[PDB]
GROMACS .gro file of N, CA and C in nm:
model
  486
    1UNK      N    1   0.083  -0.121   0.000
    1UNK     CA    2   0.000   0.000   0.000
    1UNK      C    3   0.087   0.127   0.000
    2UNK      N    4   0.111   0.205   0.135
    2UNK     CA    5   0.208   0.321   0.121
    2UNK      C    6   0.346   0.269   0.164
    3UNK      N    7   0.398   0.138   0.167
    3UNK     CA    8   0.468   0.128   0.192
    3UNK      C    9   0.508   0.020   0.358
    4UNK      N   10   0.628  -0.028   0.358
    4UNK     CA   11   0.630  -0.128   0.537
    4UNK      C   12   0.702  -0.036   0.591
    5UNK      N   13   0.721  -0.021   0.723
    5UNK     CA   14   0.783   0.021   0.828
    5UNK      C   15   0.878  -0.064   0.934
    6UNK      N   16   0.979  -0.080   0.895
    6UNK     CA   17   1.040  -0.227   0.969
    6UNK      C   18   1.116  -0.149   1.105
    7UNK      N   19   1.059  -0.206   1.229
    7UNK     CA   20   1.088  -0.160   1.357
    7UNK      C   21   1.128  -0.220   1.422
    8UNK      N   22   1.284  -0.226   1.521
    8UNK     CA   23   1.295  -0.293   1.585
    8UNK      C   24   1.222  -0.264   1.737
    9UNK      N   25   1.093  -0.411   1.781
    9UNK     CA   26   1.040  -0.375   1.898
    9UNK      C   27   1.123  -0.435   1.995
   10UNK      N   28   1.238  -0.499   1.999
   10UNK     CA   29   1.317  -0.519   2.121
   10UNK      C   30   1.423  -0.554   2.094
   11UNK      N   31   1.565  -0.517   2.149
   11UNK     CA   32   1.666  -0.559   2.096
   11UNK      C   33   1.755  -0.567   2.285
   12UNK      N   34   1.787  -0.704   2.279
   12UNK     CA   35   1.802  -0.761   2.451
   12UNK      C   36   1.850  -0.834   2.432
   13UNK      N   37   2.022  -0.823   2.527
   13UNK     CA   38   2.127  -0.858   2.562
   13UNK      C   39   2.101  -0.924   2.707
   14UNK      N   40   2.129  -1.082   2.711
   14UNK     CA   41   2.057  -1.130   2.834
   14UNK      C   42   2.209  -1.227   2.861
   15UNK      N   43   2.257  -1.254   2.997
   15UNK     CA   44   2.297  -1.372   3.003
   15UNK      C   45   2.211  -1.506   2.999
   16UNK      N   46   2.141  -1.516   2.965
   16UNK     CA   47   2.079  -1.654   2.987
   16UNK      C   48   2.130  -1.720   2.814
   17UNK      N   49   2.132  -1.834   2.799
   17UNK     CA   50   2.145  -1.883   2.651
   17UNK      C   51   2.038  -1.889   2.571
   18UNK      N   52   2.072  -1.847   2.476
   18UNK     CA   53   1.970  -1.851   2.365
   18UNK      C   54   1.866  -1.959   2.325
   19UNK      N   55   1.889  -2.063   2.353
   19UNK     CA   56   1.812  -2.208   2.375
   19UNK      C   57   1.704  -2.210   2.445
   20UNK      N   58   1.742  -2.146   2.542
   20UNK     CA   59   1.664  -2.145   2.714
   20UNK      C   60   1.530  -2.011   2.664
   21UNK      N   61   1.578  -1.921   2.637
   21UNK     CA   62   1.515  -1.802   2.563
   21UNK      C   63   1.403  -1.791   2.459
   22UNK      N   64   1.477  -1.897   2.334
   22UNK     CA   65   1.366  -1.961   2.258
   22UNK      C   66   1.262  -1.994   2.298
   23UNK      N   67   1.327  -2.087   2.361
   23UNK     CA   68   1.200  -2.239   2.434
   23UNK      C   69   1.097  -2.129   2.508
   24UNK      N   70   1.158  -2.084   2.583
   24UNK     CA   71   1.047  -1.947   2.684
   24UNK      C   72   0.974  -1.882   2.579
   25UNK      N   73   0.994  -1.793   2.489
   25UNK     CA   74   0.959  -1.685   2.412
   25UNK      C   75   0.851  -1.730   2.283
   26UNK      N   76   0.939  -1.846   2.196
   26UNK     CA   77   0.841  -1.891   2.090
   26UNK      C   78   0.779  -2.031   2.118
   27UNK      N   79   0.818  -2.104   2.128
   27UNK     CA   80   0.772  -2.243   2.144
   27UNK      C   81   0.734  -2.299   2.273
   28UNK      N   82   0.745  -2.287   2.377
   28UNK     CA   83   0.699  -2.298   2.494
   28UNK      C   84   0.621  -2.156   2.609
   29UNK      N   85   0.587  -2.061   2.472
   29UNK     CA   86   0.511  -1.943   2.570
   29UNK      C   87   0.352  -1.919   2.593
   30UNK      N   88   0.337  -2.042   2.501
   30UNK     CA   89   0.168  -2.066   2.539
   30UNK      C   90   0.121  -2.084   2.667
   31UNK      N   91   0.243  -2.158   2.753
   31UNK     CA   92   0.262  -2.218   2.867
   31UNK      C   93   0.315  -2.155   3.004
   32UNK      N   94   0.391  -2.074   2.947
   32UNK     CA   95   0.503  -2.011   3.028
   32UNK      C   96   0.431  -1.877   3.054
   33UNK      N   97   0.372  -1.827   2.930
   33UNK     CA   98   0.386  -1.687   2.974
   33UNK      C   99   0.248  -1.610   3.081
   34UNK      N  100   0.137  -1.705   3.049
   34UNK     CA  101   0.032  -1.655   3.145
   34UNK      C  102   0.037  -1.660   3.263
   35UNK      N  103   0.129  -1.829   3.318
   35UNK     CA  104   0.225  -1.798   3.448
   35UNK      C  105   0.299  -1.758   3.530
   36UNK      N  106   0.384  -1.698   3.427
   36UNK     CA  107   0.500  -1.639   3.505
   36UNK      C  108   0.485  -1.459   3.437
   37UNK      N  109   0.359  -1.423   3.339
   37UNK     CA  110   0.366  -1.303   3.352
   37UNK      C  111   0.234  -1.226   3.292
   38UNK      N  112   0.167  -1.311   3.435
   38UNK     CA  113   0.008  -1.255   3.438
   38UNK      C  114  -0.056  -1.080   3.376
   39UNK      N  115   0.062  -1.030   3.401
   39UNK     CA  116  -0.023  -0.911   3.429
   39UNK      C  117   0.012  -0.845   3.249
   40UNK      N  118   0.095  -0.924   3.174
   40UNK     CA  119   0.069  -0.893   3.056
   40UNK      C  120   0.028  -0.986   2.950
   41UNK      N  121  -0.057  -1.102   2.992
   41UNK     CA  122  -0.094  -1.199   2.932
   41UNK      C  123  -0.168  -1.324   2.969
   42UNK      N  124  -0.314  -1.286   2.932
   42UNK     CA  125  -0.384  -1.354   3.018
   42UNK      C  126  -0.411  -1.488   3.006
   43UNK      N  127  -0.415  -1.483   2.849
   43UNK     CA  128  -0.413  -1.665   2.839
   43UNK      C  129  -0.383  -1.682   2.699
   44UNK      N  130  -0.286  -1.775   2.636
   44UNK     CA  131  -0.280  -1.768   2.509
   44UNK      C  132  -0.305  -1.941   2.481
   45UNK      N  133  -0.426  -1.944   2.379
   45UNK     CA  134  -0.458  -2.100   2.286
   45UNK      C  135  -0.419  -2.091   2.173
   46UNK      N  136  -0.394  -2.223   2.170
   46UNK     CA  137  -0.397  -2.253   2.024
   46UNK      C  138  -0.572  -2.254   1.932
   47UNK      N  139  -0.558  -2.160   1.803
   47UNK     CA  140  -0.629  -2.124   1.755
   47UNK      C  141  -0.655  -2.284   1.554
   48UNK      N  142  -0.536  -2.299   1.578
   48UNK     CA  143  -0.467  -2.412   1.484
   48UNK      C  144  -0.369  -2.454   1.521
   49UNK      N  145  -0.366  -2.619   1.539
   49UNK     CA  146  -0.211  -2.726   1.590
   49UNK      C  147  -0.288  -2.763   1.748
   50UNK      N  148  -0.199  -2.780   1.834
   50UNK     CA  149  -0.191  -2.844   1.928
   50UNK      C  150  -0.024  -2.826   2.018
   51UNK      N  151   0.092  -2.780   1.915
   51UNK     CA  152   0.195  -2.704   1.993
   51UNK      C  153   0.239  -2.641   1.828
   52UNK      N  154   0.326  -2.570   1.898
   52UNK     CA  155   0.421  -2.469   1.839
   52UNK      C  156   0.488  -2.520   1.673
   53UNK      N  157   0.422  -2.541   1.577
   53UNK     CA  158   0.487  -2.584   1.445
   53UNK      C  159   0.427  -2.462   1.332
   54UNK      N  160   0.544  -2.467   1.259
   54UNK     CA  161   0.490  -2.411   1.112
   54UNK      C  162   0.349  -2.467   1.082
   55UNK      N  163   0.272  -2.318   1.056
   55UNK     CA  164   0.153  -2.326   1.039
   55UNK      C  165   0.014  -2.333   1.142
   56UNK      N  166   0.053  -2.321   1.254
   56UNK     CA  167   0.009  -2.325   1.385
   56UNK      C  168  -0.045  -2.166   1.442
   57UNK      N  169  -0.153  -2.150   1.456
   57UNK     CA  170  -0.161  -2.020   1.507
   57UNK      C  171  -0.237  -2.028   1.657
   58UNK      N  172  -0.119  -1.931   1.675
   58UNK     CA  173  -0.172  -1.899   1.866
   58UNK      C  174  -0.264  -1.756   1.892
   59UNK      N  175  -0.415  -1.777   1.916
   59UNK     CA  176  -0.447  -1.647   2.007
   59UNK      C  177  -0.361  -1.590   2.177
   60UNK      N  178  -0.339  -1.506   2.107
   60UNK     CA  179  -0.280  -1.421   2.272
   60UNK      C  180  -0.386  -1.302   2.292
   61UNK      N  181  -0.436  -1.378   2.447
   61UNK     CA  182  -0.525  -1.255   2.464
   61UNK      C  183  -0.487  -1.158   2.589
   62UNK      N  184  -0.513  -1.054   2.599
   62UNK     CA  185  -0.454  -0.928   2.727
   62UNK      C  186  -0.525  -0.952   2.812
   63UNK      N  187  -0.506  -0.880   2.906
   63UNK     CA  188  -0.592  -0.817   3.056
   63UNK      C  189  -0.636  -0.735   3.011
   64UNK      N  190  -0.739  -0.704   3.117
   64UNK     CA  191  -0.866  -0.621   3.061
   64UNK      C  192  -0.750  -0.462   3.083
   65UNK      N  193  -0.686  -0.447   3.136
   65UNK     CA  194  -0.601  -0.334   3.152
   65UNK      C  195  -0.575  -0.262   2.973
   66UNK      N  196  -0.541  -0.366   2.942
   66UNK     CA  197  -0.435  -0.359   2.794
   66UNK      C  198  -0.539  -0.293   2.711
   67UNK      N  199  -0.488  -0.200   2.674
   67UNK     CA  200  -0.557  -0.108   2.517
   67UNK      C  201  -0.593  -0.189   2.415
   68UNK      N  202  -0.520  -0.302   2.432
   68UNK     CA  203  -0.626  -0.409   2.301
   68UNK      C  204  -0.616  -0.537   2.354
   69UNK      N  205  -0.731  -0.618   2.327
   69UNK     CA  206  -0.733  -0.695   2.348
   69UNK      C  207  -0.713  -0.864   2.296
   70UNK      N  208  -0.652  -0.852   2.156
   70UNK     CA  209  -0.598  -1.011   2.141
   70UNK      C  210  -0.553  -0.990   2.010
   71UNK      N  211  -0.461  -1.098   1.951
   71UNK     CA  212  -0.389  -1.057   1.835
   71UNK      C  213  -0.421  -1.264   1.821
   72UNK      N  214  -0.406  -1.274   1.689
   72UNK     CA  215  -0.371  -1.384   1.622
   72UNK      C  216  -0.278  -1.431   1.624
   73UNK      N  217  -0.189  -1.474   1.601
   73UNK     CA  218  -0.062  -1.531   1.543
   73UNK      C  219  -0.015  -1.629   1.458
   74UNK      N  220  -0.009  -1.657   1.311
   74UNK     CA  221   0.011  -1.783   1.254
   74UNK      C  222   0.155  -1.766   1.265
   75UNK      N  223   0.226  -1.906   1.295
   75UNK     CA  224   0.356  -1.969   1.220
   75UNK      C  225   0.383  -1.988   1.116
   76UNK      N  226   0.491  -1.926   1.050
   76UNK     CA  227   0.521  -1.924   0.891
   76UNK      C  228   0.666  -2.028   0.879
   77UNK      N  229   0.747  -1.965   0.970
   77UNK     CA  230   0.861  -1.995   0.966
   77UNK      C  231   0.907  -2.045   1.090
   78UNK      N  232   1.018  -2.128   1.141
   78UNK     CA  233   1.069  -2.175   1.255
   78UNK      C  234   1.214  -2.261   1.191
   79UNK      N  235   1.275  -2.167   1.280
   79UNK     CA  236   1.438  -2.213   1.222
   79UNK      C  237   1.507  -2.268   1.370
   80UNK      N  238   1.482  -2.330   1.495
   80UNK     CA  239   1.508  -2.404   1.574
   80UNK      C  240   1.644  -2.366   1.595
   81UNK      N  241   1.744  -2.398   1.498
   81UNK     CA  242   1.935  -2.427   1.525
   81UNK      C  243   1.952  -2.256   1.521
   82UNK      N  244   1.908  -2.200   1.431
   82UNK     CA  245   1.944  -2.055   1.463
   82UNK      C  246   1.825  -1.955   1.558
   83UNK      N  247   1.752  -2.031   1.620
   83UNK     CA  248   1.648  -1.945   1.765
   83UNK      C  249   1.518  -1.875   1.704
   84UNK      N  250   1.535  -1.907   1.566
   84UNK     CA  251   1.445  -1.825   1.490
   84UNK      C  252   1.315  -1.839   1.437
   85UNK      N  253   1.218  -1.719   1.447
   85UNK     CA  254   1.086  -1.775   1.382
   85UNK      C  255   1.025  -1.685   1.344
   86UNK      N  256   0.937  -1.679   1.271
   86UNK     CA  257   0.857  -1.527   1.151
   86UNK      C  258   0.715  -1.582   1.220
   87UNK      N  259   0.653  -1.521   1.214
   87UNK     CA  260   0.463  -1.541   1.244
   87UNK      C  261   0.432  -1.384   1.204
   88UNK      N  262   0.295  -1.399   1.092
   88UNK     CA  263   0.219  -1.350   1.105
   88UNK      C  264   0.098  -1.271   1.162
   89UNK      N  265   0.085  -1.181   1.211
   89UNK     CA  266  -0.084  -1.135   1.256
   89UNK      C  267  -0.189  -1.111   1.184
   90UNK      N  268  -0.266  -1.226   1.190
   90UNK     CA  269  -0.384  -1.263   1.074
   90UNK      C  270  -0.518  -1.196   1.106
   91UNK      N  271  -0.538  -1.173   1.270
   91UNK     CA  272  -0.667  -1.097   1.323
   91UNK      C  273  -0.550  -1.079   1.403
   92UNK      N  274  -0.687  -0.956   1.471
   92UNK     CA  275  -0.646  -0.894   1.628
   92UNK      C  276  -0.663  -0.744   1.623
   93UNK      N  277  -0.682  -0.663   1.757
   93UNK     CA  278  -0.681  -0.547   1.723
   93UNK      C  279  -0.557  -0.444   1.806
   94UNK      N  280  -0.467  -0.533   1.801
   94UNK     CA  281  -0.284  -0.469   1.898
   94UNK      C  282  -0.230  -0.399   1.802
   95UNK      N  283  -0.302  -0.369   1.701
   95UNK     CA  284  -0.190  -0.255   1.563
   95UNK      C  285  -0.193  -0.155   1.630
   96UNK      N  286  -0.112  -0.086   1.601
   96UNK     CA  287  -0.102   0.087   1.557
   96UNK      C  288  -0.213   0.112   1.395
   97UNK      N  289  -0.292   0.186   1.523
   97UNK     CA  290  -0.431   0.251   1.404
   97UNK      C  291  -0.405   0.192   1.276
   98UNK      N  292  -0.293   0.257   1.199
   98UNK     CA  293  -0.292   0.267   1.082
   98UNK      C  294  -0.205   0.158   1.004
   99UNK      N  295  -0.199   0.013   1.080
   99UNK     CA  296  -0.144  -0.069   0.950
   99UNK      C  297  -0.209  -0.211   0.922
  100UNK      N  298  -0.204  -0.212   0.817
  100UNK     CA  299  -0.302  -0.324   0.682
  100UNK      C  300  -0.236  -0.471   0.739
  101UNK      N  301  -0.118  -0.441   0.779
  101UNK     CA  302  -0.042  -0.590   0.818
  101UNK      C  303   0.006  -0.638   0.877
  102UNK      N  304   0.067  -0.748   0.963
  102UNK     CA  305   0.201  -0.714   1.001
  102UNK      C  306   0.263  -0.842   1.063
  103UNK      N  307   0.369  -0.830   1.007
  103UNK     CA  308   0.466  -0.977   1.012
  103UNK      C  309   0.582  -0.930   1.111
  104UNK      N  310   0.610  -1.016   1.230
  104UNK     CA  311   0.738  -1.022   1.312
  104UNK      C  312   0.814  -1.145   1.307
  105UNK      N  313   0.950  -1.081   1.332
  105UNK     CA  314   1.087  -1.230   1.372
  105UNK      C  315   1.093  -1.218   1.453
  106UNK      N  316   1.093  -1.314   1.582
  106UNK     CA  317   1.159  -1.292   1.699
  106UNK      C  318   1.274  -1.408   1.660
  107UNK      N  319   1.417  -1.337   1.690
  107UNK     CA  320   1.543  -1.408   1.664
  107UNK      C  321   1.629  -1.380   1.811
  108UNK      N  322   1.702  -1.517   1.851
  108UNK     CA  323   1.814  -1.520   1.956
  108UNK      C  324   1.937  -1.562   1.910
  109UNK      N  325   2.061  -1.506   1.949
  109UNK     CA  326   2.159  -1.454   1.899
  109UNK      C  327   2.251  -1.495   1.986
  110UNK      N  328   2.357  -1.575   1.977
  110UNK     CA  329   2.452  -1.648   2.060
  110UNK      C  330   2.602  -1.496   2.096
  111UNK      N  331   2.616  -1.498   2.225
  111UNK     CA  332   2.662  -1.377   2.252
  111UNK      C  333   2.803  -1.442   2.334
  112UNK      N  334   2.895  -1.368   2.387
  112UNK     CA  335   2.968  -1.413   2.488
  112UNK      C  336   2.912  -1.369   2.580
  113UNK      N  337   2.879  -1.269   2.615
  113UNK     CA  338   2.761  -1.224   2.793
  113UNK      C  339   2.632  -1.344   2.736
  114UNK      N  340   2.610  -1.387   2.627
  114UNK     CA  341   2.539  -1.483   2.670
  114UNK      C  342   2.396  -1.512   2.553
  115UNK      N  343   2.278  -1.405   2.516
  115UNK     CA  344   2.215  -1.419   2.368
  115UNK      C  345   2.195  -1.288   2.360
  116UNK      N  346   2.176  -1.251   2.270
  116UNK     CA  347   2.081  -1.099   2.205
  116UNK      C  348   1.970  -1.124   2.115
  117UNK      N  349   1.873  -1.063   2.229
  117UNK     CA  350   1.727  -1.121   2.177
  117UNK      C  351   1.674  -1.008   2.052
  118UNK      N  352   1.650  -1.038   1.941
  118UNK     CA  353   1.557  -0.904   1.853
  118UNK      C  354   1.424  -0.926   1.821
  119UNK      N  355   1.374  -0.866   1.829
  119UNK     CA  356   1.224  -0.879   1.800
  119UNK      C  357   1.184  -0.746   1.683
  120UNK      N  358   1.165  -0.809   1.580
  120UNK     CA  359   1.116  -0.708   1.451
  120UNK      C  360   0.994  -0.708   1.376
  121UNK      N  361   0.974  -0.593   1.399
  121UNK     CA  362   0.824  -0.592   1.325
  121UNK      C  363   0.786  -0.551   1.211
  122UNK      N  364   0.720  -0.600   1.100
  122UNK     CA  365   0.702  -0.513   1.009
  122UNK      C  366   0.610  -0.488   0.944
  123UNK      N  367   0.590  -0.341   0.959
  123UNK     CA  368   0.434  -0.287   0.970
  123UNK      C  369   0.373  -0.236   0.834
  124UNK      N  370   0.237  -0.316   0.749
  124UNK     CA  371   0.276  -0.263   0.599
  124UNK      C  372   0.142  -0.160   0.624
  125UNK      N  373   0.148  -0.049   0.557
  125UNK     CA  374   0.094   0.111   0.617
  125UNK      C  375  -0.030   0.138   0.514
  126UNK      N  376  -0.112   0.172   0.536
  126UNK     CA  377  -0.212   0.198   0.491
  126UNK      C  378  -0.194   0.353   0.396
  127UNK      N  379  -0.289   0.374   0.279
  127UNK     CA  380  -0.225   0.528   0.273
  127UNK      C  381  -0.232   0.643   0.327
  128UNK      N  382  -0.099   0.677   0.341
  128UNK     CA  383  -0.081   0.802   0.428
  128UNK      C  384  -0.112   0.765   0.569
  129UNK      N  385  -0.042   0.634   0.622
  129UNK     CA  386  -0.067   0.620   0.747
  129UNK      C  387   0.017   0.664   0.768
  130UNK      N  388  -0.012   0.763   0.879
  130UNK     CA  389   0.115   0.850   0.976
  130UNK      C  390   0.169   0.777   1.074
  131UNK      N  391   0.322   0.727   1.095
  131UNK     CA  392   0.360   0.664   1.190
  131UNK      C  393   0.455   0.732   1.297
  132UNK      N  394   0.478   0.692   1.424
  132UNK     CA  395   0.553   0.783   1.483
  132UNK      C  396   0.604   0.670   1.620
  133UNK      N  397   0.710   0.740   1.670
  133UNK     CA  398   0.753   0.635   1.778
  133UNK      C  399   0.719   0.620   1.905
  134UNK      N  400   0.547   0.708   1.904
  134UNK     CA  401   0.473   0.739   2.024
  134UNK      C  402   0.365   0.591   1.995
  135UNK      N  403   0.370   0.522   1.875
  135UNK     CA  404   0.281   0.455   1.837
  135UNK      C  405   0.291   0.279   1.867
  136UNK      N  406   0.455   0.306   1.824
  136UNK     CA  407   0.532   0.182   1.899
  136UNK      C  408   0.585   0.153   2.026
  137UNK      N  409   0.629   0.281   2.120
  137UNK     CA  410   0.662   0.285   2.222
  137UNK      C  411   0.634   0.188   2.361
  138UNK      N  412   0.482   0.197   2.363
  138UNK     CA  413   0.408   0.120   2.432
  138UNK      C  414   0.431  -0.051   2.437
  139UNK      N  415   0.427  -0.073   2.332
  139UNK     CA  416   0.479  -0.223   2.292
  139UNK      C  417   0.610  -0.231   2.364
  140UNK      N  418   0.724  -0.113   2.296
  140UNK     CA  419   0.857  -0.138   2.321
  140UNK      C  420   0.887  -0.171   2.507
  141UNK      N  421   0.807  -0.102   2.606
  141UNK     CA  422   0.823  -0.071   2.701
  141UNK      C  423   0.777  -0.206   2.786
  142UNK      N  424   0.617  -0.240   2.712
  142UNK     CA  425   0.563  -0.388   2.754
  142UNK      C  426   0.659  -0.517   2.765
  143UNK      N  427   0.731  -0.514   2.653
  143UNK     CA  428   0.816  -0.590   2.610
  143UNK      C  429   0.908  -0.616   2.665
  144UNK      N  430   0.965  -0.479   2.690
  144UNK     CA  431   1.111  -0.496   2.798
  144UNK      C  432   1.108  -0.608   2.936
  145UNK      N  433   0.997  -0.494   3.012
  145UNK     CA  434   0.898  -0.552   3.121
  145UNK      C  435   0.879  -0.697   3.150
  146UNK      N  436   0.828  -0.792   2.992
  146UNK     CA  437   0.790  -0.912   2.989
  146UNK      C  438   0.908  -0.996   3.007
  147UNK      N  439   1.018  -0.973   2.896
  147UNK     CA  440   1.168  -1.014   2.917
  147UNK      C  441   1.214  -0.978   3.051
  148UNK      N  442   1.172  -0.870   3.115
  148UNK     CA  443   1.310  -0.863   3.238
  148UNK      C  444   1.220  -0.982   3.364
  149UNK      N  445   1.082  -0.982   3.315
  149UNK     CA  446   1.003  -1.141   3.424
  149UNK      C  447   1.031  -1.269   3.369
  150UNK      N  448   1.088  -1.269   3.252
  150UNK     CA  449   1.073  -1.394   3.176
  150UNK      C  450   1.252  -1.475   3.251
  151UNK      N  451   1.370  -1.390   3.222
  151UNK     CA  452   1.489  -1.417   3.267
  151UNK      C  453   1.488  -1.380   3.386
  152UNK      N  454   1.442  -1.353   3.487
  152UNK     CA  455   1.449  -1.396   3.609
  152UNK      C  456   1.396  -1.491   3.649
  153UNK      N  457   1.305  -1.545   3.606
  153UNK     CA  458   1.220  -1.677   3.645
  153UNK      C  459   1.326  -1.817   3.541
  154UNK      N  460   1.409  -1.750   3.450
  154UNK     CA  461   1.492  -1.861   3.388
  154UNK      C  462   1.606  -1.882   3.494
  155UNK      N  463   1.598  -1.733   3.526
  155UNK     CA  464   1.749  -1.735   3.626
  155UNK      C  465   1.734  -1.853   3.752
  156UNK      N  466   1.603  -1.831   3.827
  156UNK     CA  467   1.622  -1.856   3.933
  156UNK      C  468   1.545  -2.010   3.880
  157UNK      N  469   1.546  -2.084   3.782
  157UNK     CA  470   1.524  -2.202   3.781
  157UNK      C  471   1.563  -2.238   3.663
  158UNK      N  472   1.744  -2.235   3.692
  158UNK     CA  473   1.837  -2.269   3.533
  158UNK      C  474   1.825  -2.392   3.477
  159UNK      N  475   1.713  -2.521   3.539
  159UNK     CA  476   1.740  -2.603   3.441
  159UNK      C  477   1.636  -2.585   3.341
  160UNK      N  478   1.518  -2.522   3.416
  160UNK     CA  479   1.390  -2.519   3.285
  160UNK      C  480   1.479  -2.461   3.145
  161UNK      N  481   1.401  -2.576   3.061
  161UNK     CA  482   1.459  -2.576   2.899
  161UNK      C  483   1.602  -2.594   2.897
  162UNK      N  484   1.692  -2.632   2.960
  162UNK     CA  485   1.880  -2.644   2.955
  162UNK      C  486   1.819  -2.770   2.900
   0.00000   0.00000   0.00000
């Protein structure tokens, strides 16, 4: 349409290993994350599959707090040896007003302090959708938040996923 907007929504330098990170973040967060981080995720199903494979889509839905309340997610891609995976947002209403689409990677990154997590989004814009970094911010900040509960709960129980 007017064009994508490719944003990085998190870019996180963690000691924990990238393995451990994965397993938490893409493939084991259906599980993980309503537990260990209630207050930004209230319950996420599978919408298609039964676990985490190409082609599998997970509803994630919010707390009633959250400005929106549930996003889709299909699996497109899953690259396992390099931490990596693409999904789609097929429904939901977690956009920024103004975009038609939007596809993320969340990728983990083998570090000597340990992984570097990125999370990228890319937003395809409606015309003359006005974008700004007051629009993404919110996400960026959620995000941090979710990661800094996610590696402490890896920390303080290093064998989950080793």
């Amino acid at each position: 349409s007017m064009g994508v907007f490719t944003c990085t929504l998190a870019d996180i330098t963690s000691p924990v290993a990238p393995a451990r990170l994965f397993q938490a973040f893409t493939i084991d967060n259906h599980n993980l994350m309503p537990k260990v981080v209630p207050q930004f995720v209230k319950s996420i199903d599978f919408v298609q599959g039964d676990s985490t494979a190409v082609g599998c889509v997970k509803q994630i839905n919010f707390p009633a707090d959250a400005p929106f309340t549930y996003v889709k997610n299909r699996v497109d891609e899953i690259d396992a040896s390099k931490y990596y995976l693409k999904y789609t947002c097929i429904e939901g209403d977690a956009f920024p007003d103004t975009v038609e689409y939007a596809v993320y990677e969340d990728t983990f990154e083998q570090t000597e302090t340990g992984s570097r997590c990125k999370m990228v989004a890319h937003y395809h814009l409606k015309g003359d959708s006005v974008m700004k970094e007051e629009d993404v911010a919110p996400a960026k900040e959620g995000i941090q938040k979710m990661f800094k509960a996610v590696e402490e709960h890896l920390i303080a129980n290093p064998q989950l996923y080793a």
